[PDB]
């Protein structure tokens, strides 16, 4: 029951991961799915990677997010080393030592977006909306598709997520308060939250809304 994907690897690097996967009877694919159990990141000597879509989605889904070093060493040592020893530890944006991968790996109940209701008010670069939505969902939000489809009532907090500089004729992303009763955060709020596997506070992401 092992499926993995890779991120930020060169073709030569992919091949080692291949050769590796071949040896340990591991399924290896291009696309991350729910069945993926591992994500192999290009990292530096101490397990800091860059932030990629798969990075996000493998944290979101509580998967093994491991250094490519997991691979090269298991090869160097002619046996499969342990993931715990190669678990990526940080990224170049969210800090070197935060351990999102670990946090998320364990906290599959205490799920960072519990009882939030998010709306990815499109458009986004480098990321289909539904991936962003899948991402918040793996993290326990529920996805509203439409500004008006919020489920206000008791207990349930709404959030509109946007990517300001993804807009054509912009500042329309300032007119969203006039369309409903939700905080409006940058996508960075989601990405940092997910990196850190810990729900950030909106404050530094809040987009100010024109009444």
């Amino acid at each position: 029951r092992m499926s993995m994907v890779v991120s930020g690897l060169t073709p030569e690097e992919f091949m080692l991961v291949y050769k590796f996967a071949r040896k340990h009877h591991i399924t290896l694919t291009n696309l991350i799915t729910e069945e993926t159990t591992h994500v192999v990141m290009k990292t530096d000597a101490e397990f800091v990677c860059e932030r990629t879509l798969k990075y996000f989605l493998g944290i979101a889904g509580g998967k093994w997010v491991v250094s490519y070093f997991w691979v090269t060493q298991s090869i160097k040592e002619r046996k499969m080393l342990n993931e715990h020893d190669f678990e990526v530890r940080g990224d170049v944006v969210n800090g070197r030592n935060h351990q999102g991968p670990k946090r998320a790996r364990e906290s599959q109940d205490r799920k960072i977006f519990r009882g939030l209701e998010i709306c990815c008010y499109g458009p986004f670069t480098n990321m289909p909306t539904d991936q962003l939505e899948w991402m918040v969902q793996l993290c326990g939000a529920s996805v509203v598709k439409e500004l008006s489809s919020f489920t206000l009532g008791t207990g349930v907090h709404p959030i509109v997520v946007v990517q300001p500089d993804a807009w054509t004729e912009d500042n329309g992303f300032h007119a969203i308060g006039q369309m409903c009763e939700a905080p409006v955060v940058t996508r960075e709020w989601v990405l940092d939250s997910v990196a850190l596997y810990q729900c950030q506070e909106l404050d530094t992401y809040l987009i100010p809304q024109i009444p």
Binding site: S7, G8, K42, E50, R51, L53, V93, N126, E188
Partner: peptide, 12 residues
């Protein structure tokens, strides 16, 4: 700065 495969999500 280079980028080797997948889009990267960097400095805010």
């Amino acid at each position: 700065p280079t980028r080797v495969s997948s889009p990267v999500f960097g400095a805010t």
